[PDB]
Design a protein around this ligand. Sequence first.
Ligand SMILES: CC(=O)CC(=O)SCCNC(=O)CCNC(=O)[C@H](O)C(C)(C)COP(=O)(O)OP(=O)(O)OC[C@H]1O[C@@H](n2cnc3c(N)ncnc32)[C@H](O)[C@@H]1OP(=O)(O)O
Ligand SMILES: CC(=O)CC(=O)SCCNC(=O)CCNC(=O)[C@H](O)C(C)(C)COP(=O)(O)OP(=O)(O)OC[C@H]1O[C@@H](n2cnc3c(N)ncnc32)[C@H](O)[C@@H]1OP(=O)(O)O
Ligand SMILES: CC(=O)CC(=O)SCCNC(=O)CCNC(=O)[C@H](O)C(C)(C)COP(=O)(O)OP(=O)(O)OC[C@H]1O[C@@H](n2cnc3c(N)ncnc32)[C@H](O)[C@@H]1OP(=O)(O)O
Ligand SMILES: CC(=O)CC(=O)SCCNC(=O)CCNC(=O)[C@H](O)C(C)(C)COP(=O)(O)OP(=O)(O)OC[C@H]1O[C@@H](n2cnc3c(N)ncnc32)[C@H](O)[C@@H]1OP(=O)(O)O
Ligand SMILES: CC(=O)CC(=O)SCCNC(=O)CCNC(=O)[C@H](O)C(C)(C)COP(=O)(O)OP(=O)(O)OC[C@H]1O[C@@H](n2cnc3c(N)ncnc32)[C@H](O)[C@@H]1OP(=O)(O)O
Lengths: 260, 259, 260, 259, 260, 259
Amino acid sequence: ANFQYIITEKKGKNSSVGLIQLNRPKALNALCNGLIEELNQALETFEEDPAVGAIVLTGGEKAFAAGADIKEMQNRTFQDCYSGKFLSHWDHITRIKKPVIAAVNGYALGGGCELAMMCDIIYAGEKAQFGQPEILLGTIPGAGGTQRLTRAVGKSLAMEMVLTGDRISAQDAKQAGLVSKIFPVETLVEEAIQCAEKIANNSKIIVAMAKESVNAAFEMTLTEGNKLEKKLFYSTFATDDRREGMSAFVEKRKANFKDH
Amino acid sequence: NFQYIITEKKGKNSSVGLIQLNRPKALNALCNGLIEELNQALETFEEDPAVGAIVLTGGEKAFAAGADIKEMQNRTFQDCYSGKFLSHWDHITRIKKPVIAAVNGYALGGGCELAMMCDIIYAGEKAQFGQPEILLGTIPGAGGTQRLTRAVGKSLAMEMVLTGDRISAQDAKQAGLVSKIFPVETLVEEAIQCAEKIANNSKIIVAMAKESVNAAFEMTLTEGNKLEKKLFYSTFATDDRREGMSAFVEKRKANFKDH
Amino acid sequence: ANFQYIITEKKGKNSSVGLIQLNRPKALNALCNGLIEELNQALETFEEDPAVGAIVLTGGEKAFAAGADIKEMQNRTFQDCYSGKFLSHWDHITRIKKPVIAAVNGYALGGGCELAMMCDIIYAGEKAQFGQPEILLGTIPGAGGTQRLTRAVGKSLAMEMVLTGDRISAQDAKQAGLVSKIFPVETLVEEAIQCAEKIANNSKIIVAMAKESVNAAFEMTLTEGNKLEKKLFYSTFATDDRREGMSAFVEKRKANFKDH
Amino acid sequence: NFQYIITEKKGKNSSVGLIQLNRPKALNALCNGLIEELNQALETFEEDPAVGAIVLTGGEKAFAAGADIKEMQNRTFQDCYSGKFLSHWDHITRIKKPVIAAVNGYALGGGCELAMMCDIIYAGEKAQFGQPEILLGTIPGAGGTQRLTRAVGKSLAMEMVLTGDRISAQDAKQAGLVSKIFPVETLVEEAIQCAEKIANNSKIIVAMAKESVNAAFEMTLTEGNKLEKKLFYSTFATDDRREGMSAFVEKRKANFKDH
Amino acid sequence: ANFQYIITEKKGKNSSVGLIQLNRPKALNALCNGLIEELNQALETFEEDPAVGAIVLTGGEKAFAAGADIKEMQNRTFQDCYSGKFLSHWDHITRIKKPVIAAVNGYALGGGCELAMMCDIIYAGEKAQFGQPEILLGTIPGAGGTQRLTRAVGKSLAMEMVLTGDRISAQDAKQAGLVSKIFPVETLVEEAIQCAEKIANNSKIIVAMAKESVNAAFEMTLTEGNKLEKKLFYSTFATDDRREGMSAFVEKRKANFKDH
Amino acid sequence: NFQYIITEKKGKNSSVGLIQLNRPKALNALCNGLIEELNQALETFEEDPAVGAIVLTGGEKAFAAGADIKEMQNRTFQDCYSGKFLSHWDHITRIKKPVIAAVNGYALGGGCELAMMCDIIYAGEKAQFGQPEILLGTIPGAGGTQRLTRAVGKSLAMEMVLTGDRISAQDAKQAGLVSKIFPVETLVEEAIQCAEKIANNSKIIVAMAKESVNAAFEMTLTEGNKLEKKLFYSTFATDDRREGMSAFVEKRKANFKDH
Ligand SMILES: CC(=O)CC(=O)SCCNC(=O)CCNC(=O)[C@H](O)C(C)(C)COP(=O)(O)OP(=O)(O)OC[C@H]1O[C@@H](n2cnc3c(N)ncnc32)[C@H](O)[C@@H]1OP(=O)(O)O
Ligand SMILES: CC(=O)CC(=O)SCCNC(=O)CCNC(=O)[C@H](O)C(C)(C)COP(=O)(O)OP(=O)(O)OC[C@H]1O[C@@H](n2cnc3c(N)ncnc32)[C@H](O)[C@@H]1OP(=O)(O)O
Ligand SMILES: CC(=O)CC(=O)SCCNC(=O)CCNC(=O)[C@H](O)C(C)(C)COP(=O)(O)OP(=O)(O)OC[C@H]1O[C@@H](n2cnc3c(N)ncnc32)[C@H](O)[C@@H]1OP(=O)(O)O
Ligand SMILES: CC(=O)CC(=O)SCCNC(=O)CCNC(=O)[C@H](O)C(C)(C)COP(=O)(O)OP(=O)(O)OC[C@H]1O[C@@H](n2cnc3c(N)ncnc32)[C@H](O)[C@@H]1OP(=O)(O)O
Ligand SMILES: CC(=O)CC(=O)SCCNC(=O)CCNC(=O)[C@H](O)C(C)(C)COP(=O)(O)OP(=O)(O)OC[C@H]1O[C@@H](n2cnc3c(N)ncnc32)[C@H](O)[C@@H]1OP(=O)(O)O
């Protein structure tokens, strides 16, 4: 449909990369309900697009996303939150099977940091900044900022960031494992598209299974994660792509995956 | 009046409660008496409405060199079990207000664990962390095999616990055990500044945030997120959340009231 | 025993370190069923060897282990995998109570990375490279590559490694916590043996308790991990070594452990 | 204008939303269309401020005999995986208001799982529960090996799942799969009575309680108790908890306002 | 100490059973702060008492405990709850190592049901009634009523009880596994004391290990519960009592436990 | 050449593998030798393509009276630890084919645990279950404090483990420890009939179902459901599923080939 808050584009070789750009620079991409509703539509679209194997989520040079919309939350009451299931469409990105890479340029604060962390991989621009300034507004992170952050960065830094609201640089974020790669502000999105391309080249069904396996590292004990992983591993043998990728390795040729 | 520790209220408007382990002749080894006082001091700052965060530190040479070996020396397994040995050691984990550990020098054995029990660890340039319990024929007994591993990774945790080797302030920060390194001289001052920032925020909200972050080690991500959302919703039941958000919108400085 | 694929040696002071070396350089130490069956034999032997307190696993200078043997997997179906418990003897190393240190020189890819990660400690040579290229073959990691990697390195790098098949250097691996030490290619195994030697010097029973305690960090909530740890800690008081090690500190002398 | 189901608002002040699976010719086998409508009805009652509890039932002979086998028949593994097969099935688990299953007759396979997805199960005297998926060369795919096991124990769950054998209303109740058995004739009426009692209580508190009870299957007891305590504290942020407790103290009937 | 709300007594053979009776019949034993403070003092006392091997907690014939004190909660705010750690001393009973058996006669509602559930074993009088009427007061159970109840009784009955506030009889409670034995109103406490007697006859250190093992069934996966149990099992071999209990079976005589 | 057990291939088509503990002199007390053979027999039936389900039983008077006390009597703490005491005991839990325990008479200590390690338990009218380890100065060491608690509830488990008391076949069934009670004489025959039903179905699917049910004790419901769904999708990769579903549609008997 026609978008008010975001710009979607199909990029990369064979237009296998679905680029989603948050376009609400006036509010530093603050995540209002309408922006979220469109972002989710775009995600579902790329998800249903057979040509797209990976999605790249980004904002502007100055801000990936400054957080949830404070103006929209200001008049909410506890009872509203509860009965109105406040923020329940926020984590839809986590239902997408295809990989999503966040190309974070500038500010990724509050709900913005959380949106980036909801993504599978995070690439950061040289000037990017991450933070959970919710405490400064008399609230706490509400979409995984006390969970995903802690799991990536450690208790000490997570506590420090969540309790003070202080920002960390692209560097601190990479050193801490919040993000895996840092690129120049200008080449960042291009670089993230390159990474999405490699992933898109691979089998879609296998990639989906791999992503589901990695995610499970945060939902079970190591014993059970390893067992689930083994079960998915066994499942790959039920696809043609596995046959194709293994035979191509043996046959020392290039594999022609067909996402089946 | 304490024998083993020195307490002080610092920070802007005396919002930071400083606890300093003071048993330098034993390199702040954690004897029963020291722990009993530490817990008293913690409970006090916990109950003091002017204090929003606590900073725990030791000396320049040692934060804490470990449990008191001499006091464990003649203990038996039935003594340990029945006497619930070391049960008062993790009282610090019951404190709702944030505790920041300003680790200068040695933070070994029970000292490393005490630091890790804290919410945030700041380390002096000359700080050293380690779990030498294995060298004594014992293993870490207050989270040294647990909080260490969760912060530093299996390989380094195993290496530290199985050999008893120490890591530097730098290795500790690179690994995520500590989040900041500061010069030996300005370390406590720097930790107090961090504590001040925290005390300036709404105590009730800060307590909820800390509880949320801690939950990252007690549940699956799905449940952690759900708990988090419930606390997030709860913040809307406070005056501070209303204030904090209207202030943003009204382009003004929020005035929190811990309510 | 008489080994086709590996070389075992008892090294270190008092021959306390059991050295196991993958020796199938033509396949760059690719893990075939036979290699695994021997690896497990060697492991069990060193495990039952009272003189051995720690084991060091290594491969060649060019490769620790470049992956499972694809030819061997190439013709399996899903039902074969399932009914035949494919790869089930792969994680036997995880049943060994004595510490295992992996001295990774060169490639540690696929099944090789997983095997290294199954070890308690990982030391890496300067030219070491880690990676999970399974996705390139139309399959996913099947021996903890999506689990132990994620738990050591974080979601962003793990997803990136597993979804693209890209390799990371020894430095990236150390920065991220996958490995705890990096040493020159030449002195690596020697350095790992020193580490195992240090560990063998301690009481075996206590060391086995410690290792079991650390591993529990990936199988329980922190509350339960801390309670199990406390129970093992109490158990150490039931041994003679605990007494000896504590008296020795008090008495200002060297402890004389007896593994009891 | 539903093809496969019949919705009705019942109970005092039409507080109960009654959904009736109406596809008797197929014994209410859960086809995609039936599920799409069920989900529509659920979401509607969910959004209806007049409704506080939902009662889901089928016919006298069958609550639901399972997924539509003919619709599953030509599916491949790639279809199942890539097509997120059965993902719209557990939508009922996202409804905040309580759902009570009034199971009359057969509740087999996908039908047993649908009933187990509900918060409370009332069973008619002639009701039968079972997981016959094994007889079709497949296993339960919507919680039949999970919710069943947690309610009935390993031995009976393994037996039912591995042989495909049915258990009676009595066995189900004795096992804790269902909490009440009623005559075939008065079953739905009795389930509506229960839903009525629920609807008279504060909606917000009822949603909190249901969320707390469900957490018993997603966390350790320690964490469940902590989450529960936090929801407990949250109830104090509502007008209804004030009302409820004052009414006790003032010796009067409480008037809840779902706020 | 000087108890206002409870009556303590040491009963049974050798006065091994420490009896605690809630004695505030005018408020049907409602759990006011003072009653809880005394209950905890009495528990700690029996806990520190060498002659007591088990505790039996009971109320009056009409009510075990009708719930928390509504009058005391009435004026509480969300902020009071949070900041004041409301109900913090409520589950101190769960820190007691010696077994506690609840002899429930009459009403065991709200905080009263939860208190009984915090106990290790629950014996119920023929006229006992259990329930969680918190919902009728505009609140939910706040000391395990949504947790321990569900785990003992199943989702359907728990949901039904918690959402409607309906009570269940002694029989429904036993059938459901909430309570393991039902006895006549008049002989109930006597019967519970006999049970506490048997327990007090065994080794206290072993009994504490066993209770801690069973409790772990609600805090871990079956894999880890089994491992923890095995570790406690091994620990029993570090005691004299195990030596004694096993030799006595072999020697076909009576075991003489000395609690170590 | 089994000293302690009797194995037999029963059931239609000799699809049921019966293992009989045969050490009545010591009421089938589980000695190391007995266990080593039990494990061999299990592995054999596991590798036997004609066998689809195993039935484990003892004598009329006792299934198994516990671990051998004489053998444990001189063990030390270091023995247990370093020697991995009782490590081969739960090998039965590695068998992927369903195992049904036909418990007649005593099933105490290690005996109860062994029965509980089985997937399904059928009990003779005179059967008795218990965990008397406490009477010997020890605690259950092979899941008696775990599987018991999970099937029977905390109150009964605590009572059984802390007092050493026995419960009857009826108490066991009422509590869900066992799913069926049969006359002492017809018990094994009845268990074989069950094992036969299981053996009739696809072995691959049955193994997936059993693994799914077992997962109910190793994860949160969310994850259990997700794992279950993945196995469910996997069944579509088998020929048996296609067959089982065609048979229904085609109103004919399914002919499974275990793949
Ligand atoms: C569950 C949750 O997850 C909840 C949350 O995230 S809520 C809180 C998290 N986010 C925040 O607190 C960030 C607040 N924003 C800031 O601190 C600053 O915008 C900044 C430091 C990021 C940038 O500073 P700056 O360069 O001076 O830009 P700034 O003028 O503030 O913002 C530009 C515009 O975007 C708006 N904006 C920025 N962040 C916003 C937000 N989170 N919500 C709504 N509007 C926002 C600004 O108000 C301004 O609009 P107007 O002047 O027309 O009102
Ligand atoms: C459950 C648990 O968690 C258990 C544990 O932590 S116990 C093990 C952890 N701690 C240890 O192993 C302590 C090791 N200590 C040391 O190696 C050294 O004290 C050190 C490396 C920290 C510093 O070295 P140093 O500058 O040469 O100081 P050093 O002379 O050795 O010690 C100074 C004084 O403090 C005492 N001390 C240091 N650590 C101690 C401890 N953990 N317990 C008791 N006394 C201790 C020393 O014995 C000495 O006192 P005395 O001379 O009166 O006997
Ligand atoms: C993820 C999942 O969880 C998936 C699923 O549950 S798989 C489904 C599990 N269910 C089964 O295996 C089949 C259950 N049904 C039966 O066994 C029998 O219908 C019954 C025992 C319920 C009743 O037997 P019955 O009284 O003799 O009636 P019966 O003739 O078999 O069936 C009634 C009609 O509804 C159809 N029907 C029954 N169960 C159905 C199902 N699960 N799906 C689709 N149609 C079904 C029947 O085919 C028949 O229609 P037709 O005569 O036009 O062909
Ligand atoms: C975290 C939590 O878990 C919190 C809680 O449980 S909150 C609420 C749970 N408990 C309840 O709802 C109990 C309410 N009580 C009742 O419904 C009834 O007392 C009963 C059904 C138990 C018995 O009815 P009854 O025989 O007519 O006795 P009743 O007159 O109501 O009560 C006897 C006296 O004890 C008081 N009492 C009973 N239950 C009480 C409670 N939970 N708190 C405080 N006082 C209570 C009564 O108010 C009355 O005192 P007064 O007449 O002097 O005011
Ligand atoms: C890790 C673990 O999980 C460990 C274990 O379970 S610990 C063991 C738990 N089992 C027990 O405590 C043993 C219980 N057994 C007995 O008390 C009785 O045998 C019984 C109550 C089962 C039945 O009573 P009974 O019919 O009168 O038989 P009884 O005369 O006592 O015993 C019959 C024979 O089998 C032996 N026996 C019974 N149970 C045994 C056991 N668990 N271990 C070893 N031998 C046992 C008896 O010693 C006797 O052998 P001998 O006469 O040749 O010396």
